[PDB]
From Swiss-Prot, chain B:
Belongs to the bacterial ribosomal protein bL21 family. GO terms for biological process: translation. Part of the 50S ribosomal subunit. Contacts protein L20. One of its GO terms (cellular component) is cytoplasm. PANTHER family: 50S RIBOSOMAL PROTEIN L21, LARGE RIBOSOMAL SUBUNIT PROTEIN BL21M. HAMAP family: Ribosomal_bL21. This protein binds to 23S rRNA in the presence of protein L20. The keyword Coiled coil does not apply. SUPFAM superfamilies: L21p-like. This is Large ribosomal subunit protein bL21. InterPro entries: bL21-like (IPR028909), bL21-like_sf (IPR036164), Ribosomal_bL21 (IPR001787), Ribosomal_bL21_CS (IPR018258). Keywords: Ribonucleoprotein, Ribosomal protein, RNA-binding, rRNA-binding. One of its GO terms (molecular function) is structural constituent of ribosome.
From Swiss-Prot, chain D:
The gene is rpmF. One of its GO terms (cellular component) is large ribosomal subunit. GO terms for biological process: translation. Keywords: Ribonucleoprotein, Ribosomal protein. This is Large ribosomal subunit protein bL32. GO terms for molecular function: structural constituent of ribosome. It comes from the Bacteria.
From Swiss-Prot, chain E:
Keywords: Ribonucleoprotein, Ribosomal protein, RNA-binding, rRNA-binding. One of its GO terms (biological process) is translation. The gene is rplD. Transmembrane segments: none annotated. One of the primary rRNA binding proteins, this protein initially binds near the 5'-end of the 23S rRNA. It is important during the early stages of 50S assembly. It makes multiple contacts with different domains of the 23S rRNA in the assembled 50S subunit and ribosome. Forms part of the polypeptide exit tunnel. GO terms for cellular component: ribonucleoprotein complex; ribosome. It comes from the Bacteria. Residues 1-46 are annotated as: Disordered. Belongs to the universal ribosomal protein uL4 family. This is Large ribosomal subunit protein uL4. GO terms for molecular function: rRNA binding; structural constituent of ribosome. The chain holds residues 55 to 210 of 215 of the full protein. Part of the 50S ribosomal subunit. Disulfide bonds: none annotated.
UniProtKB/Swiss-Prot annotation, chain G:
One of its GO terms (molecular function) is structural constituent of ribosome. HAMAP family: Ribosomal_bL20. CDD domains: Ribosomal_L20 (cd07026). One of its GO terms (biological process) is translation. The keyword Iron does not apply. Pfam families: Ribosomal_L20. Belongs to the bacterial ribosomal protein bL20 family. Keywords: Ribonucleoprotein, Ribosomal protein, RNA-binding, rRNA-binding. PANTHER family: 39S RIBOSOMAL PROTEIN L20. Coiled coil: none annotated. Signal peptide: none annotated. It comes from Mycolicibacterium smegmatis (strain ATCC 700084 / mc(2)155). This is Large ribosomal subunit protein bL20.
RNA sequence: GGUGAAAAGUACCCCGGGAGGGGAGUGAAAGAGUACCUGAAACCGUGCGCUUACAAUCCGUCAGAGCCCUCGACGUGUCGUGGGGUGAUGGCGUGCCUUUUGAAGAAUGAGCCUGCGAGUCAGGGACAUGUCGCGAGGUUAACCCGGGUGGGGUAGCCGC
RNA sequence: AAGUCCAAGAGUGCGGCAGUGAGACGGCGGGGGAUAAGCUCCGUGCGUCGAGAGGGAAACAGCCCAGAUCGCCGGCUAAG
RNA sequence: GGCAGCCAACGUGUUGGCUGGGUAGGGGAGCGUCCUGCAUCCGGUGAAGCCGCCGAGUGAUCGAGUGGUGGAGGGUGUGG
């Protein structure tokens, strides 16, 4: 098994789907390429995703003593976390529900020999 | 050589050493059962006359009596409330043919 | 357990039927039988275990009665009033193989396996076909008597 | 109008998969002796120092 | 639903809202509403005939007698001070079964106190003798006064 | 001896309550009342 | 004596969900929707189990008819001849011979043709 | 409403502005981290296996090709009384409920899951169906006494 | 008089505990209608569906065959 | 071949032979849940619950079979 390091960004104030939109971009790529794509991705969800990927890389470097250049985004996924319920008033005094969703973005970077 | 053997209201193509599941036979595991043959084929000699077949008998050892697949019946008729749940496991007997 | 065709035990054979002065329906029935593989003891309805059937002289098919002018082949394009009808005679003149093709296809089952079976039919509006390399067997439509 | 049936999972996901981001095409740019990845669109700006590469 | 607080007012109109018709927020289907056929306080006692009760008690005691589970004792402890030690030793002498019904007179407070704290021992008076206790007890240890009182009460 | 766990009702003494309206395998749905009517929801007076 | 009905409910729910495991969509996930299909699934199982005998007899008959006409005899006359000859081989094993033992099937065809009347269409 | 037995409530370091994590430590257990006992379903992902872009599917069921694991003859991959999946293809196949003469019905209800949600109780009530006691008798009500479910209590009731 | 013979699950009487009291079509005998209606109202030890699956009627409650206790890698047939 | 009332038997009456589509509805017999009298078992050497594996029963359903999670109760019998 490849030496892996984990990083979970929990309760991120972004939808699980909107985090997944960029996690799909940077799943499978090396850590460096993933961070570059998340740097130049126009989606705002790329910033928490980039931060959690970089945290996984930092854990691999410091807590695990792995070579940062050999790291790769092995398994990354955003699960949906808690959802706050808000009320938006609409016409005729009718209250519609608004969902302030969060996401847990889990990242596991492995150190693979190219 | 093989034979179309009659047993349990059904016929089975069996050669010496063939293992066949058939209806339940009143015989112990390890006992021997002689079964009438609907046909015998020896390479090219096809014994099919009833007079000649009455002489032939497929001998088979009873390996064990087993139960078939669990059949689950749910007789349902819509808009009547009629459900009937039922189960079934046929009692089968496994025979290893020893000779013909 | 009943025999089931496994992997590649389905052997295929090539037949060539001369459609000259033969009834369209009889030829199509025999060709559909061959394309299904109903003529083989290993026939299984869910298996395309049929045989390739070349039909030569499709233009020289025979139709009784007035089917050559009174029978029509219809096609709707999906547009309003888009029903085009072409008599059997006109169809045999313009696309001669299409009459035999349509007969055989209609006599074949209408499903995915039927359309897979269709690919083994080779209708030609002439005495010759390009599949001589397949060494097709001349198939004469013969009735088994009782 | 209003959806008449609940959309099946298969259809919902088949058509939801179309809401995907397109990864930017990154080219290499040498700035401050370092090889960074920037869009070819921002290649000139990065060379001139008008891109914040952090 | 009538005893649950609130619920007097109809929750909303009968028609128009597009919701199910409700006549009370405390209707049974509602969360927090009343219980339809729930328990209500009731007296479960039965008016079993006197002859039935007495015959059942006599049958239980007869079973104990037939199985030699009935014992008689002058008292449970010697002296005026109760002693569960002495009572336990004497009961062990009498029987070894776990549960024993001790049937002693009311004035036998010394014996009652002496024997009452033994785990399986149950103490009653001859006048309150009953089939439940007799059957629950493996043995029945009567005092002599208690046995004579029971016999007199049931024979005279 | 006869202990409390040896006590049982007389054969045929106790009978299960007819718990009505519990699935179609028993007296379910209408609970023996049949389809609509007065008797579907109440008792008709004897008089 | 309040009773919570989760223990009892989840039993049948798990039964139906495990039975409907493999169904597409709501039928494998939701007990209520699985239950509707499970009614249909078991009704179909009963019906198809009754009809499987007919389906397999149809398959055997098709194979026997193919083998018979390959032997130059129709299936109906083959069956007539076998009955006249007293051959009591069921269509299952007749098809088994047709596929695995064509020589034996040809021998049976010869027996049936010999047992057939001199004129099958005669008023007899 | 529920961390843990005890805050022992995670020092210190690292990524991060934080939030949140990763090491480390506490703890029997952080598969107990003040979002905390267990942690179901719905619902939402990620990974793997099969399948699927010529196909008309109440979504299943019966056959069923092709694609991995449990014991062995044999010595090694082709079998088996064997044992799960995935489903090319073929046949059959008109949801459930209510209510109707009749509904797949284009009639009603249900978006889904979980939890709750409907013949129950009182009374010597009334009418019919096993047991105590009789021998023509059964019973007691109120009430009295008993620290109980036991003992008394004949008024009355029903048979006569 | 027999026949139905391990009885029809028969008839009768008394207590069960009911629901049912919206029927449908088809064949025969009729009324109303125009001797129309998939009309309506009657009769029919007439049938079927209701409450009935299975096979045939392409599909198709009422037509035809036939009344599903459950299984079977069996056989004979019904209407077709 | 497997399962559900009546008949014969000689003897302990459980063996053999004659038997069953179903809505309203009636009768019978049961499954599962909780709480309990008594009896008896299991449980921090891991109860319940939950997710499985392997199976099982004619049905409701089963699991003193078993793995994982779990952390304190639970099972069985006979009665209420």
């Amino acid at each position: 098994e490849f030496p892996s390091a984990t990083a979970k960004a929990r309760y991120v104030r972004v939808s699980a789907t909107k985090a997944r939109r960029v996690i799909d971009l940077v799943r499978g790529k090396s850590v460096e390429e993933a961070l570059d794509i998340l740097r130049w991705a126009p989606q705002a969800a790329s910033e928490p995703v980039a931060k959690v990927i970089a945290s996984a890389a930092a854990n691999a470097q410091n807590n695990e003593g792995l070579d940062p250049s050999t790291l790769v985004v092995a398994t990354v996924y955003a699960d949906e976390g808690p959802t706050a319920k808000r009320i938006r008033p609409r016409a005729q005094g009718r209250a519609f529900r608004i969902r302030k969703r969060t996401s847990h973005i889990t990242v596991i970077v492995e150190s693979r020999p190219p | 050589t093989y034979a179309i053997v009659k047993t349990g209201g059904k016929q089975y193509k069996v050669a010496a050493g063939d293992v066949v599941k058939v209806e339940k036979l009143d015989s112990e595991p390890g006992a021997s059962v002689s079964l009438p043959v609907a046909l015998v084929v020896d390479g090219a000699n096809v014994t099919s006359k009833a007079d000649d077949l009455a002489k032939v008998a497929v001998t088979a050892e009873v390996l064990e009596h087993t139960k078939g697949p669990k059949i689950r019946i749910h007789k349902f008729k819509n808009k009547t409330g009629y459900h009937k749940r039922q189960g079934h496991r046929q009692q089968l007997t496994v025979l290893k043919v020893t000779g013909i | 357990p009943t025999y089931t065709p496994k992997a590649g035990d389905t052997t295929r054979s090539w037949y060539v039927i001369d459609a000259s002065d033969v009834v369209l329906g009889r030829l199509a029935s025999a060709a559909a039988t061959l394309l299904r593989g109903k003529h083989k003891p290993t026939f299984t309805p869910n298996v395309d275990g049929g045989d390739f059937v070349i039909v030569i002289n499709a233009d020289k098919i025979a139709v009784s009665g007035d089917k050559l002018t009174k029978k029509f082949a219809y096609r709707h394009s999906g547009y309003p009033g888009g029903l085009r009808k072409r008599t059997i005679g006109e169809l045999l003149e313009k696309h001669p193989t299409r009459v035999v093709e349509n007969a055989i296809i209609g006599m074949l089952p209408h499903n995915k396996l039927g359309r897979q079976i269709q690919k083994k039919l080779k209708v030609y509006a002439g005495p010759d076909h390009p599949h001589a390399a397949q060494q097709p067997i001349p198939f004469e439509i013969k009735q088994v008597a009782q | 109008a209003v959806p008449k049936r609940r959309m099946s999972r298969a259809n919902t996901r088949s058509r939801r998969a179309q809401w995907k981001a397109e990864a930017p095409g990154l080219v290499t740019v040498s700035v401050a002796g370092q090889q960074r990845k920037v869009p070819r669109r921002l290649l000139k700006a990065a060379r001139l120092g008008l891109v914040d590469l952090d | 639903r009538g005893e649950v607080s609130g619920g007097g007012k109809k929750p909303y109109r009968q028609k128009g809202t597009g919701r199910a018709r409700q006549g009370s927020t405390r209707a049974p289907q509602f969360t927090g509403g009343g219980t339809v056929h729930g328990p209500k306080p009731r007296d479960y006692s039965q008016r079993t005939p006197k002859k039935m009760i007495a015959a059942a008690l006599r049958g239980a005691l007869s079973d104990r007698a037939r199985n030699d589970r009935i014992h008689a004792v002058t008292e449970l402890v010697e002296g005026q001070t109760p002693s569960t030690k002495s009572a336990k030793t004497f009961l062990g002498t009498l029987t070894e079964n776990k549960k024993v019904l001790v049937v002693i007179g009311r004035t036998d407070e010394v014996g009652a106190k002496s024997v009452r704290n033994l785990p399986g021992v149950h103490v009653i008076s001859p006048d309150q003798l009953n089939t439940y206790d007799v059957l629950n007890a493996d043995d029945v240890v009567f005092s002599v006064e208690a046995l004579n009182a029971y016999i007199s009460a049931n024979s005279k | 001896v006869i202990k409390l766990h040896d006590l049982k009702p007389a054969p045929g003494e106790k009978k299960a309550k007819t718990r009505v309206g519990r699935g179609e395998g028993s007296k379910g749905k209408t609970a023996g009342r049949g389809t609509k009517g007065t008797k579907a929801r109440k008792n008709v007076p004897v008089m | 004596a309040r009773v919570k009905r989760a223990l009892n409910a989840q039993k049948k729910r798990r039964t139906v969900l495990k039975a409907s495991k493999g169904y597409r969509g709501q039928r494998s996930r939701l007990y209520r929707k699985a239950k509707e299909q499970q009614l249909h699934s078991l009704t179909y199982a009963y019906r198809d189990r009754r009809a499987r005998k007919g389906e397999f007899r149809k398959l055997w008959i098709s194979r026997i008819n193919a083998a018979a006409r390959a032997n130059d005899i129709t299936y109906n006359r083959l069956i007539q001849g076998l009955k006249a000859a007293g051959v009591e081989v069921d269509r299952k094993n007749l098809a088994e011979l047709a596929v695995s033992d064509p020589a034996a099937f040809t021998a049976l065809v010869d027996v049936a043709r010999a047992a057939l009347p001199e004129d099958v269409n005669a008023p007899s």
